[PDB]
Amino acid sequence: GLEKGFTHPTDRVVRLKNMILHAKPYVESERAVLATEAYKENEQLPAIMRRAKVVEKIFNELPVTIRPDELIVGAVTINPRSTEICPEFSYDWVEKEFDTMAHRVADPFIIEKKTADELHQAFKYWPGKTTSSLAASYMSEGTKESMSNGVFTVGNYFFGGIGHVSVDYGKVLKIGFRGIIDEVTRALENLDRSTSDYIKKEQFYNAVILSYQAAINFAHRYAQEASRLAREERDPTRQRELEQIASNCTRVPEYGATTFWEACQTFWFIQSMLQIESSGHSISPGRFDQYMYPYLAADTAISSEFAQELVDCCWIKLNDINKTRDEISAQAFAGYAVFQNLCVGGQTEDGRDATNPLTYMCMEATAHVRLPQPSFSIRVWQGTPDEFLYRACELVRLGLGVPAMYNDEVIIPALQNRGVSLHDARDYCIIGCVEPQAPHRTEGWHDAAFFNVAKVLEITLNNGRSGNKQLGPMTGEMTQYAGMDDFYAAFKKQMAHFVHQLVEACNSVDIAHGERCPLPFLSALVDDCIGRGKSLQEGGAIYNFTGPQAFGIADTGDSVYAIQKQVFEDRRLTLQELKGALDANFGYRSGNPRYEEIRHILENSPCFGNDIDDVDLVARQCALIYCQEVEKYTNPRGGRFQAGIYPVSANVLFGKDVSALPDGRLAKEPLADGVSPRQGKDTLGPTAAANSVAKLDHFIASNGTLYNQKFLPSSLAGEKGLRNFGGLVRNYFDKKGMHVQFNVIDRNTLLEAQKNPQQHQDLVVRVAGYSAQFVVLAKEVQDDIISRTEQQF
Amino acid sequence: GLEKGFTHPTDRVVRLKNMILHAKPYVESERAVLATEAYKENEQLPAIMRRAKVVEKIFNELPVTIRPDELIVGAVTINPRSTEICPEFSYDWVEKEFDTMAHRVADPFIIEKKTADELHQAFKYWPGKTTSSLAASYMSEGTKESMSNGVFTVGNYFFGGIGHVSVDYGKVLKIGFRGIIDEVTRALENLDRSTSDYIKKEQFYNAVILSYQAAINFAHRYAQEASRLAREERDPTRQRELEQIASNCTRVPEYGATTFWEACQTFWFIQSMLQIESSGHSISPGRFDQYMYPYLAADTAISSEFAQELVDCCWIKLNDINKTRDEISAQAFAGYAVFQNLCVGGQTEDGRDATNPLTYMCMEATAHVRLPQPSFSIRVWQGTPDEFLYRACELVRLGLGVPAMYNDEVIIPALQNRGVSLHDARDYCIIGCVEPQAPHRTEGWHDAAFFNVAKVLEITLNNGRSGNKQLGPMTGEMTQYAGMDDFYAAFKKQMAHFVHQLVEACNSVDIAHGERCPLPFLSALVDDCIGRGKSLQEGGAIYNFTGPQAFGIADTGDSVYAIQKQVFEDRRLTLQELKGALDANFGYRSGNPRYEEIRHILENSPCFGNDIDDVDLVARQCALIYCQEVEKYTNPRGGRFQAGIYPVSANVLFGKDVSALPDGRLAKEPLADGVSPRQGKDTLGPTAAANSVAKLDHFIASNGTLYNQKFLPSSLAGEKGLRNFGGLVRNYFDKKGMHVQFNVIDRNTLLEAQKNPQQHQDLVVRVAGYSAQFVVLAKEVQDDIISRTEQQF
């Protein structure tokens, strides 16, 4: 039968899982202090060589920690699930939050007094030497004013590192760090030295070699710690394990992997070491079933049980990573989340189906571990085997939010439209939440900014004003609109003004990272940085993009359609009354009964998400106006801006920046998540809603769209629930939606977790493009997830 | 007749002159301290804006000093003829020399204890933050090793600023600093903001505007000081002068000049303020008679005596500038020397003669003032009026070394061969010593390096060795040469190896200046920096070059010819004995009589400078081998390397780096100056010697060649003396030599200045492309000048 069920993990895997779940996150100082001293010691070097010295000091001197029971080793932090500090990007919020970070609503971290004193001393070096301080200096005053008023924000790469990449894991698996060094050495040998261009390329090459020499030492330090622990082990079974780990770390990643266990250790060293070099999140394993499976197939000795246990251990290690952000930024990325997206299935470079036995082991590992990370995903195409889709649906029924599902038949042509070859696009993986790329060939900047389209709508209707600040052009007061043509013309002018500022802000951050923090370790693992002699930050990648995200799409669409229908077509109210009602927040505080009646009229207009073409096409048009502006622009790496539509955990946060809207929502209330219909407003069932969402132009939003659905668990029960559920996915993907993902949970389970969080520490659910512990989320985010529409078949 | 003699200066001018002569040069700290605080305060800015903040703080806060009697005001230093410190380029040698600089051989400066304490504190900021520290980091180990062994040096721009430019004085005279600000404002309004490129251009533009706003303030601060002094001044005439100076400085250079006195004040504000922004020397007024004359002709009130006295005051102000360098570099640029070349005459853009009345006033000013500066020059072409050449010749007869003479008919086609338009080339001026450019269109880097061709010959004959060290390729041992073909093959291979390293070193310094010290004040006065939105350091100039200088040309030619004639042709000695004699320094210590007999044989070979084709063509070929290798290379500004041949005061210094040579020269002895025949070896008179020098390829050495002659004064006496002397210049220029200049002095006058320097403080003579106080020069440089061939007709 279609319902196969899931096996159980070993007792050791349960212990390792529980270590993550019980861990109290700390802030730690050692990496920050070492980095700072490497900067201090190397003021005279070009930035790329200084950055080599940084990772060399950290890799040589960071504490090496092997946790009880691990088979796969490597720790960013001494304490499980803790965070380093990367002061080179930003630091002052850390010190501002020394005493409040342990108690803040979103993602609290403990900062012990000694750690605070150590960070205080190191931060003395940093004023004005960060990437953020340089980025802000490049931006115009109007751009900064627009961000201060909540039109958009580039905080992600402003305050932290970039990340958002899937590196060439397979290359390191094959030839190791030593192979990387040899490739660079041959690039040096072949350098054209007839002009002045070789001088900086040679600095890059020597920086990469130094970085990778230190990276080899780092693995050897873990081998040494494993041997030290082995000598004082008393259980001979664990002793032999530690001896085997020492052997593994001696071989990899210096050399290519020769067993499946070594291949797992190669993967984890890369995955953790990249996040030691930089705090950029969305370091995404990508197509792990593809590049790892050859090492499983070739390992004739390994048992199926132990092979699965190693994948489980990788899943758990993926949850050891954590990241603190400033108190407001943490609310937009909430849940101790670093967005490591790992996908399985899809197509080979040849257009054949890519499923292999490891594909299903990856699904089993998710069922075994049941933790937020990795951000597990499946690719789907016309040739997806029934067995893979139904097994994925079985996994989704567990209610963890994973796997998210991505549609090859939209994503591949979407990438092609941006210049990615068919061969490279067929190999895509997901970065972060929903953002597709050709892996190890792209510097995509896939979460460069958040952009509030609903705020632009607000500002349009107030003639460029926000507060009493003239923030955009005076496109005309809404009372002077003769019809919807006047609105759209005004809305497009506002969009052009604010998107140009968005692009300025992203590109200023882009220049700042290129000038102050080019990365020699990361860059060697992406084509064509070695061949070109250029870092990722300076255009070494074959493909270059920048991806800013739209917020408030359904809010904007339903509001614009409410103006069309209720004011112009049916004349239920005038432009003057609408203006008055919006400014008065529909009488929320005054009690004005005409404004209340107006609100009730607008609230009951047709809404996006009910398969009604009239209103669905307005949502499509409003999203297009954003997406068509964004793609007009380029970044300093020679690449193209491309829109995405996804909220991570900030559709509540950024709703606070928007006053009352013509669809009737009150000031400061939440916005809609991604391309999903407004919370509770898709009332005709999951098929009708998905039909609406697929009417949007997903292809032009080539940084990725995000669609959330939430199902009543009993609707998915039994073989016949699975079949209906799989039919819904194929329906939506056949109609050219890009992505869909599912919560499967009873309302009372969420309500109980709120009332009794101590009893629900392992409740993991989808936020948007990632899953998190529900009890870690702030109440306002929890309420937003509860408020989402419950679907039923 | 042809000798009309010279008028005398006013008593004021004599007082202003003697103030320079009697000044004891100090090191001062104010500018270094202010610059350091501006860097400390502005760590977060892009470099161009940081440099704007640097000049803003200095221009706002540097002490304002007006000296007794001046009509033209503006002081770089509080004390006359003193030096500021520019730690942004290098600092550590200043502190190493706190206790020794007042007593050192070449260019001593007094450093009082208060000043050393101030600089000690300021220097704490600088480790690793200088342009020099970055430049070194880009250079390969072999390049730095060749420099340590004396093959070549890039010290000039490594330790100090660049300079070496003639800015658009005419533009500032016409539109003022306000007009510069207006052009940049229009460039801002016209910026294409559709890509990412505008972000950095707009930073440059904002940096230029800020710098020029502060530049206006600087002039107003001098106006306020003149007004303050006027209220204090008992003498009614001097009171009115100070009131007029206050009016001048209020008008210029914020606005264009409206009198000749204001034009002189504009000139001097530009000249001094450029050398406040940067320590780069060879800030060259260039075609002063061309851009200043319209303001003289339009000034219908000024008397000729006052106009002359203002020009005299300009000449004296040019001697107020001074510059300290580390104690070894000071020996290469000896004489309190900043190389401000000012030329008169030549052609206009349409190819007409450019002589005007101010042309002759500039010659008079040199006769009035008789100080080392400016480095006064004349252009000469086929159409030079006889009155011009003969007047310049009378001036040379005064023995100051000036004017140097430059041949349009070589320089203009030479510049054309480097891509300069005929129009631009016709407007050329001289930079520094002998280096031509199209003024306000060029970033020429005209003294980027000193390169020791004689050392390359030494190394060639020792199979790539220098001392106990393999510095170049193993091109073969001397004893294995079958003939001169073998030697030239090896020599060219050595030359290619070391010139590649030279180019690396230059380009490393070039990159470092572009990344850390782009200049927003200077850059605005050179085409096309404003139009392109790019500093000079990043390629804003229309024409870009790099100019490295050959040393030991005559030494190399005569040695190579001595091998050809004495070894291969006449078989007076074997290659084996020559190797032994060179290694043993011709028996200078051993007394070996065969090596002494070989020395005598080689010393009496024919020598370059006696109009003997056989040996002259070897000098030509050897100089060509250098010049042809240099021109194969480019710089990171998109420009071309081009050789020059000139020694400034370093042919003695760099001869110390060369062991015995095949021409009989003993180890460590001086090398020949520029393209001049070896000291004392041209024995057939000045026409024969000039004929030899003109056989070299001067056109390919388009960074400039330098030829010194020295005459017995009685030989130039009378109308007949002048006629011979003009005919010699016209002979040499018709035969396509690029430059010539003359000492005219009795040997006993130099000898008496050595024995009784306190009676010869005003004795000014030519070193090489510049003039200096003979008593300020080290004994070994004095002796070298005394050893030069004395000519007579």
Clarify whether A433 is annotated catalytic: yes
For residue B633, the distance in angstroms to the closest alpha carbon of chain A comes to: 6
Strands B435-437 and B429-431: antiparallel
CA B499 – CA B514 distance, rounded (Å): 22
Answer whether A199 sits within 8 Å of B43, measured CB to CB.
no
Question: Could you please report the per-residue DSSP string of B75-97?
Answer: -SSSSTT-B---TTT--HHHHHT
Return the sign of the alpha-carbon dihedral for residues A535, A537, A540, A541.
positive
Return the sign of the alpha-carbon dihedral for residues A68, A69, A75, A79.
negative
Task: Locate B691 and state its tokens.
Answer: 């004929």
Distant-in-sequence, close-in-space partners of A105: CB < 8 Å, separation ≥ 6: A331, A778, A779
CA A627 – CA A625 distance, rounded (Å): 6
Could you tell me which chain A residue has the CA closest to the CA of B197? Answer: A636
Strands B404-407 and B739-744: antiparallel
Q: Find out whether the peptide bond into A294 is cis, omega within 30 degrees of 0.
A: no
Distant-in-sequence, close-in-space partners of A92: CB < 8 Å, separation ≥ 6: A123
For residue A696, the distance in angstroms to the closest alpha carbon of chain B comes to: 28
CA triple B259-B264-B270, angle to 5 deg: 125
Phi, psi of A450 (to 5 degrees): -115, 130
Q: How many CB atoms lie within 10 A of CB B470?
A: 12
CA B743 – CA B790 distance, rounded (Å): 9
Amino acid identity, residue A349? E
Nearest-CA neighbor of A132 among B53, B44, B515? B44
> Annotated catalytic residue: which of A435, A458, A629, A631?
A435
Answer whether B196 sits within 8 Å of A128, measured CB to CB.
no
Task: Locate B61 and state its tokens.
Answer: 């806060």
Instruction: Enumerate residues preceding breaks in chain A (C to N > 2.5 Å).
Output: none
Residue B777 and residue B763 in contact, taking contact as beta carbons nearer than 8 Å: no
Per CB-CB distance under 8 Å, the chain A contacts of B511 are: 196, 199-200
Q: Tell which of B90, B188, B198, B199 to mutate to test the A interface (max A CBs under 10 Å).
A: B199
CA B58 – CA A684 distance, rounded (Å): 72
CA A233 – CA A223 distance, rounded (Å): 15
CA B292 – CA B358 distance, rounded (Å): 8
Count of residues for chain A? 793
Amino acid identity, residue A254? E
CA triple A107-A161-A330, angle to 5 deg: 20
Could you tell me which chain A residue has the CA closest to the CA of B44? Answer: A128
Kindly state the DSSP code that residue A283 receives in the 8-state scheme: B
Instruction: Enumerate residues preceding breaks in chain B (C to N > 2.5 Å).
Output: none
Could you tell me which chain A residue has the CA closest to the CA of B633? Answer: A195
Task: Locate B304 and state its tokens.
Answer: 């000729």
> Annotated catalytic residue: which of B86, B393, B433, B627?
B433
Experimentally, the structure was elucidated by X-ray
CA B664 – CA B670 distance, rounded (Å): 12
CA A104 – CA A109 distance, rounded (Å): 8
What is chain B's alpha carbon radius of gyration, rounded to the nearest angstrom?
26
CA B2 – CA B20 distance, rounded (Å): 33
Dihedral angle computed from the Cα positions of residues B654, B657, B662 and B667, in that order, rounded to the nearest 10 degrees? 110
Amino acid identity, residue B676? S
CA B364 – CA B314 distance, rounded (Å): 13
Q: Find out whether the peptide bond into A253 is cis, omega within 30 degrees of 0.
A: yes
> Annotated catalytic residue: which of A264, A313, A433, A622?
A433
Nearest-CA neighbor of A625 among A617, A614, A613? A617
Per CB-CB distance under 8 Å, the chain B contacts of A195 are: 633-634
Nearest-CA neighbor of B376 among B402, B411, B345? B402
CA triple B270-B276-B277, angle to 5 deg: 90
Residue B568 and residue B578 in contact, taking contact as beta carbons nearer than 8 Å: no
Q: How many CB atoms lie within 10 A of CB B357?
A: 12
DSSP H or E stretch at residue A729: helix A718-734
Task: Kindly list the domain boundaries of chain A, sorted by start residue.
Answer: 11-132
CA A153 – CA A502 distance, rounded (Å): 8
Dihedral angle computed from the Cα positions of residues B768, B771, B776 and B778, in that order, rounded to the nearest 10 degrees? 10
Write the secondary structure of A97-128 as one string of H (helix), E (strand) and C (coil).
CCCCCCCCCCCCCECCHHHHHHHHHHHCCCCC
End-to-end CA distance of chain B: 21
Q: A148: which strand partners?
A: none
CA A64 – CA A72 distance, rounded (Å): 13
- Diameter of chain B measured on Cα atoms: 84
Task: Locate B683 and state its tokens.
Answer: 């024995």
Is A95 exposed, middle or buried (CB count within 10 Å of its CB: 0-12, 13-18, 19+)? middle
Task: Locate A212 and state its tokens.
Answer: 């990778």
H-helix segments, A563-711: 575-583, 593-603, 613-630, 651-655, 686-693
Provide the b/e sequence for A222-237 (b: ≥16 CB within 10 Å): bbebbbebbeeeeeee
Task: Locate A309 and state its tokens.
Answer: 């246990």
Write the secondary structure of A738-792 as one string of H (helix), E (strand) and C (coil).
CEEEEEECCHHHHHHHHHCHHHCCCCEEECCCCEEEHHHCCHHHHHHHHHCCEEC
CA triple A672-A675-A681, angle to 5 deg: 50
Amino acid identity, residue A151? V
Answer whether B43 sits within 8 Å of A507, measured CB to CB.
no
Query: Helices A304-318 and A357-369: crossing angle, nearest 10°?
Result: 60
Could you tell me which chain A residue has the CA closest to the CA of B637? Answer: A196
Task: Locate B259 and state its tokens.
Answer: 């009198």
SS3 content of chain A, % helix, strand, coil (to 5): 50, 10, 40
Residue A336, SS3? coil
Token look-up 């010190």 returns: A95
> Annotated catalytic residue: which of B435, B443, B458, B629?
B435
Task: Locate B323 and state its tokens.
Answer: 């510059």
CA B633 – CA B495 distance, rounded (Å): 13
Helices (H) and strands (E) in chain B, counts: 32, 17
Residue B647 and residue B719 in contact, taking contact as beta carbons nearer than 8 Å: no
H-helix segments, B233-287: 236-251, 260-277
Write the secondary structure of B510-549 as one string of H (helix), E (strand) and C (coil).
HHHHHHHCCCHHHHCCCCCHHHHCCCHHHCCCCEEEECEE
CA B397 – CA B744 distance, rounded (Å): 6
Answer whether B44 sits within 8 Å of A134, measured CB to CB.
yes
Could you tell me which chain A residue has the CA closest to the CA of B140? Answer: A199
CA atoms within 13 A on the CB side of B395: 28
CA triple B155-B634-B405, angle to 5 deg: 65
Among the partner-chain residues B137, B140, B632, the one whose CB lies closest to the CB of A44 is B137
CA B342 – CA B344 distance, rounded (Å): 7
Strands A543-546 and A442-443: parallel
- Diameter of chain A measured on Cα atoms: 84
Task: Locate B475 and state its tokens.
Answer: 């091109």
Phi, psi of A337 (to 5 degrees): -115, 130
Q: How far is CA A76 from the centre of its chain?
A: 20
Strands B764-766 and B771-773: antiparallel
Q: How far is CA A472 from the centre of its chain?
A: 30
Q: A465: which strand partners?
A: A470
CA B659 – CA B637 distance, rounded (Å): 37
Amino acid identity, residue A724? N
Helices (H) and strands (E) in chain A, counts: 32, 16
Distant-in-sequence, close-in-space partners of A208: CB < 8 Å, separation ≥ 6: A52, A180, A181, A184, A520, A521, A523, A524, A530
Return the sign of the alpha-carbon dihedral for residues B182, B183, B186, B188.
negative
Q: Residues of chain A whose C-beta is under 8 A from some C-beta in B?
A: 42-46, 49, 127-130, 133-134, 136-138, 140, 193-197, 199-200, 202-203, 500, 503-504, 507-508, 510-511, 515, 633-636
For residue A381, the distance in angstroms to the closest alpha carbon of chain B comes to: 37
Residue A211, SS3? helix
Whole-number Cα distances in Å, B154 to A194, B135, B160: 19, 10, 10
Per CB-CB distance under 8 Å, the chain B contacts of A634 are: 195-196
CA B398 – CA B396 distance, rounded (Å): 5
Write the secondary structure of A629-648 as one string of H (helix), E (strand) and C (coil).
HHCCCECCCCCEECCEECCC
Residue A61 and residue A119 in contact, taking contact as beta carbons nearer than 8 Å: no
CA A276 – CA A588 distance, rounded (Å): 49
Q: How many CB atoms lie within 10 A of CB A179?
A: 17
Distant-in-sequence, close-in-space partners of B718: CB < 8 Å, separation ≥ 6: B3
DSSP H or E stretch at residue B579: helix B575-583
Answer whether A133 sits within 8 Å of B44, measured CB to CB.
yes
Task: Locate B249 and state its tokens.
Answer: 């400085």
Q: How many CB atoms lie within 10 A of CB A637?
A: 24
Distant-in-sequence, close-in-space partners of A610: CB < 8 Å, separation ≥ 6: A677, A681, A682, A683, A684, A688, A689, A692
Answer whether B511 sits within 8 Å of A196, measured CB to CB.
yes
Residue B263 and residue B403 in contact, taking contact as beta carbons nearer than 8 Å: no
Clarify whether A118 is annotated catalytic: no
Q: How many CB atoms lie within 10 A of CB B613?
A: 12
Residue A181, SS3? helix
Is B41 exposed, middle or buried (CB count within 10 Å of its CB: 0-12, 13-18, 19+)? middle
Could you tell me which chain A residue has the CA closest to the CA of B195? Answer: A634
Q: How far is CA B540 from the centre of its chain?
A: 22
Among the partner-chain residues B49, B128, B504, the one whose CB lies closest to the CB of A199 is B504
Among the partner-chain residues A127, A133, A137, the one whose CB lies closest to the CB of B49 is A137
Amino acid identity, residue B747? R
DSSP H or E stretch at residue B739: strand B739-744
Dihedral angle computed from the Cα positions of residues B533, B537, B539 and B540, in that order, rounded to the nearest 10 degrees? 40
Nearest-CA neighbor of A219 among A264, A170, A263, A269? A269
Kindly state the DSSP code that residue B27 receives in the 8-state scheme: B
Q: Find out whether the peptide bond into A374 is cis, omega within 30 degrees of 0.
A: yes
Return the sign of the alpha-carbon dihedral for residues B629, B632, B638, B639.
positive
CA A644 – CA A450 distance, rounded (Å): 9
Per CB-CB distance under 8 Å, the chain A contacts of B49 are: 137
For residue A158, the distance in angstroms to the closest alpha carbon of chain B comes to: 14
Q: What is the resolution in angstroms?
A: 1.7
Q: A709: which strand partners?
A: A742
Answer whether A43 sits within 8 Å of B133, measured CB to CB.
yes
Return the sign of the alpha-carbon dihedral for residues A210, A211, A214, A216.
negative
Is B568 exposed, middle or buried (CB count within 10 Å of its CB: 0-12, 13-18, 19+)? middle
Q: Show the beta-strand stretches assigned E in B68-151.
A: none
CA B17 – CA B87 distance, rounded (Å): 30
DSSP H or E stretch at residue A710: strand A708-711
CA A547 – CA A557 distance, rounded (Å): 22
Amino acid identity, residue B507? N
Residue A288, SS3? helix
Is B604 exposed, middle or buried (CB count within 10 Å of its CB: 0-12, 13-18, 19+)? exposed
For residue B358, the distance in angstroms to the closest alpha carbon of chain A comes to: 44
Per CB-CB distance under 8 Å, the chain B contacts of A202 are: 140
Task: Locate A319 and state its tokens.
Answer: 């949850």
For residue B535, the distance in angstroms to the closest alpha carbon of chain A comes to: 17
Task: Locate B485 and state its tokens.
Answer: 């073909």
Distant-in-sequence, close-in-space partners of B665: CB < 8 Å, separation ≥ 6: B555, B559, B678
DSSP H or E stretch at residue B730: helix B718-734
Q: How many CB pairs under 8 A join A and B?
A: 84
Question: Could you please report the per-residue DSSP string of A243-272?
Answer: HHHHHHHHHTTTS---SHHHHHHHHHHHHH
Residue A446 and residue A547 in contact, taking contact as beta carbons nearer than 8 Å: yes
DSSP H or E stretch at residue B429: strand B429-431
Strands A152-153 and A449-452: antiparallel
CA atoms within 13 A on the CB side of A334: 29
Task: Locate A373 and state its tokens.
Answer: 């990370």
Q: Tell which of A41, A188, A196, A631 to mutate to test the B interface (max B CBs under 10 Å).
A: A196
Task: Locate A136 and state its tokens.
Answer: 């802000």
Q: B173: which strand partners?
A: none
Among the partner-chain residues A128, A635, A636, the one whose CB lies closest to the CB of B44 is A128
Count of residues for chain B? 793
